[PDB]
Design a protein around this ligand. Sequence first.
Ligand code: HEM
Ligand code: HEM
Ligand SMILES: Cc1cc(N)nc(CCCN2CCC(F)(F)CC2)c1
Ligand SMILES: Cc1cc(N)nc(CCCN2CCC(F)(F)CC2)c1
Ligand SMILES: C[C@H](O)[C@H](O)[C@H]1CNc2nc(N)[nH]c(=O)c2N1
Ligand SMILES: C[C@H](O)[C@H](O)[C@H]1CNc2nc(N)[nH]c(=O)c2N1
Ligand SMILES: [Zn+2]
Lengths: 418, 414
Amino acid sequence: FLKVKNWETEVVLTDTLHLKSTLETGCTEYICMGSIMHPSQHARRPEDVATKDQLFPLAKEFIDQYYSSIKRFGSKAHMERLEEVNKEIDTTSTYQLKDTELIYGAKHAWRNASRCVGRIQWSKLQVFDARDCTTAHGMFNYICNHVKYATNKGNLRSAITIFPQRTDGKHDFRVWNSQLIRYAGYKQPDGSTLGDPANVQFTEICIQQGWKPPRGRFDVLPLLLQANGNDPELFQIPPELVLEVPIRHPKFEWFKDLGLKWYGLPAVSNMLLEIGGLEFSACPFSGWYMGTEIGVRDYCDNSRYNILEEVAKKMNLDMRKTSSLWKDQALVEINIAVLYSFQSDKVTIVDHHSATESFIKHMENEYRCRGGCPADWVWIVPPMSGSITPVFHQEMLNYRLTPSFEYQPDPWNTHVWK
Amino acid sequence: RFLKVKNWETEVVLTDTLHLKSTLETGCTEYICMGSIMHPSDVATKDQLFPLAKEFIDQYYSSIKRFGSKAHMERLEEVNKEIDTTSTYQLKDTELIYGAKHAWRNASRCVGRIQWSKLQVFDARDCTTAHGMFNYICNHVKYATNKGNLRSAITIFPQRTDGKHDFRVWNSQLIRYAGYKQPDGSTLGDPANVQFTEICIQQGWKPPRGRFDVLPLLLQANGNDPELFQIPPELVLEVPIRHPKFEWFKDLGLKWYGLPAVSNMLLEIGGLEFSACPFSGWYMGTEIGVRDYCDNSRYNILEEVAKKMNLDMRKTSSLWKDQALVEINIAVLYSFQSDKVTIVDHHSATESFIKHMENEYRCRGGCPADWVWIVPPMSGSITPVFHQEMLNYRLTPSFEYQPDPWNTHVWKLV
Ligand code: HEM
Ligand code: HEM
Ligand SMILES: Cc1cc(N)nc(CCCN2CCC(F)(F)CC2)c1
Ligand SMILES: Cc1cc(N)nc(CCCN2CCC(F)(F)CC2)c1
Ligand SMILES: C[C@H](O)[C@H](O)[C@H]1CNc2nc(N)[nH]c(=O)c2N1
Ligand SMILES: C[C@H](O)[C@H](O)[C@H]1CNc2nc(N)[nH]c(=O)c2N1
Ligand SMILES: [Zn+2]
């Protein structure tokens, strides 16, 4: 057993769930790697098509967990399912999940995501089974339906669309975009960057593939979709499906003249979903924003839109020295504007005070019913005003449970073109 | 073996080899990370002390480029004699200074370590009574305060012997404000110090019962009962807090003390334990402006400031707390700078820490750093440390936490 304490409330929780952790964290009793982005390469199954003794134990573990979850461990259906999975692996080197298992696996991958502050919502996830997809055109159709469903005219709904699992590693389905909706970035001749600097490389691949860039500050990128290991294909998302919020400020009438906007739907498309040894390399999922993701990171990171200087100028702050806290002062006003703007357009958004309070409640729920909740303090604490949120004062234990979402390489680093 | 850390803002990659020198526990395991746990988890025998002493003497003679020398070998022989005959040993003055500086250098939770080699070390190992401790501490406060031009310093009292004769400063810091619980459930002064305030009162302290009463010193020598002393008021430098634009801010009546002086930690050098070792530097503004003033469990002034700012406090999404938090921290920095009392803002402090970290990697092979503590409690991602991967491990000499003395002390009077 392990205890975590909240230093504000003195609430103490006792963790037993960590006994079921599967993968290394990267830490040891002599070194802590808690602030490393990718601390571990420990995987549950090796590189490509596993042998029977490598895959079946992982499948058995997941099926056991699923049938335990529904109070049917050792039931007739449980033992038949094991026999069935055994024959599938025997004859195809893989196996196929039932619809119920796929849904259970996706929801638990979200429930197990230690870096996600939004998990109080984990059981309210709409799962779209796209495992019958065969072409990039079919992927585009599935993604359009996902975006329209999840956007829901601003009343956002969490969703995941799951394309065919990896087979041999040469027939991967991939969304080359990091998110379904991102803005292009362009290297300028004078050395600067127009648009989102984070997407410069992906933007160049799109242009190189035939995309005609309008070369503005907020150009929605095309989709670059790879089916069954083939070369990726470009598609324009119909603009009526792309909900955007123009950013204005409730007090500063000049703020609108900065010309800022953002999109409403955060839709991660570069991660891998791992369920029982199966690897779903294309599994775009979406929820709704916490305001700081846009107002602190997207807008104010030095390597992103980097707007602090512009905003502080318009505010007439003393920008001569750091100790005037002009960056901090502008940072708050920018984040007021983002929240005010989404709320004014009735687009779902959560501020970091409400989000972190919900997460503390979610932790307490999980310790009561599940005996723990894996949580990564470095990622859960918001990137502004940290200690005036309750999660700053909350001790957390981090460990890796399966099913899970994993990072994977960018496909342009691995794809051999045809 | 090597380990790489990356900065995701700059893409600089640093290579850590120094971590191979750790041999004490982080608290984590191969399958669980406890990096956000505040405290993960009588005296050394002869056999335990031998290898600890050797490792320290070895590293000291290596630092002065005398490893393997005649002097090195004779020092090791001398140390082993003392352990064999007395069950402990005594550091040379050079070794004490080196060890104190390196405990600071090794403090993975400290963002101010670019200053580590400029530490003034006061050797107080000849002290025998609480009155002598009081004298040493007054001299430290006066030296460190230096009329506002603060200088880092540490004063080292005699090491633990059998654990029954410990020297302890019972205060958590040398200068702190009292807190008083009221019958109606409210608190006057600093809520963090209510418990220590009660102990002082019970020992005979007559409290003024104000909002900013400087606490007396409660000093324990040689395992005896602790004794009360009033710090001479002219040695306590304080800064009234005002704001460069809001003339009403001074009406809040806020002030703080200039000298941050930690007195409840333990200094370990070569297996020796210095249970009383108060040390001091200068403040980073957020320590006062974010934590001391705006923690819900501390002075908790966000509401009053947001009121006077005419902020909309009905909804969290107005970010009224965030807005008030920034102005309070502007006031703290402005006030200290106007009074010419050393202070550093979190932007300057984290920039210097990154420079320090890179230098340490280049010349030492690494820099143990605790991201959870290094990143400031406000505006985290607009400081460079937020984007810097770090490795946390325990090197010795080190500063350690220890139990509060009133939880272990067995009283003697009547
Ligand atoms: C419903 C509202 C949601 C909110 C407010 C939310 C919030 C967040 C935030 C703020 C982060 C940190 C992201 C960053 O700093 O870049 C995060 C990470 C994460 N979220 Fe959630 N999230 C939500 C829904 C979801 C859903 C539906 C899923 C999956 C089905 C999910 C899976 C994850 C994962 C795996 C991570 C960490 C991996 C990574 O981003 O590198 N989240 N979340
Ligand atoms: C010179 C200016 C210094 C600055 C600006 C500075 C800054 C800081 C800050 C902001 C913290 C976190 C404190 C907290 O959040 O409660 C810290 C922790 C720490 N500091 Fe430094 N510090 C300085 C000097 C020193 C000195 C002189 C020593 C010892 C010789 C020292 C040893 C430590 C240790 C051991 C910790 C972590 C242990 C703990 O506080 O729980 N620091 N420092
Ligand atoms: C579903 C969702 C909701 C939300 N509110 N925010 C996010 C942001 C995730 C950002 N995360 C960055 C690292 C990565 F790119 F590798 C994977 C995605 C996702
Ligand atoms: C020397 C110094 C300088 C500075 N600028 N700030 C500090 C703050 C240390 C706070 N830390 C809290 C936990 C503890 F009480 F156990 C030990 C002290 C210390
Ligand atoms: C639970 C969490 O570890 C705790 O609140 C820590 C977070 N980081 C901190 N960082 C600093 N500098 N000081 C602190 O007291 C804390 N508290
Ligand atoms: C190195 C460090 O871990 C890295 O900058 C992390 C810090 N915490 C974070 N937290 C969130 N939510 N998102 C991030 O991208 C990061 N980046
Ligand atoms: Zn760890």
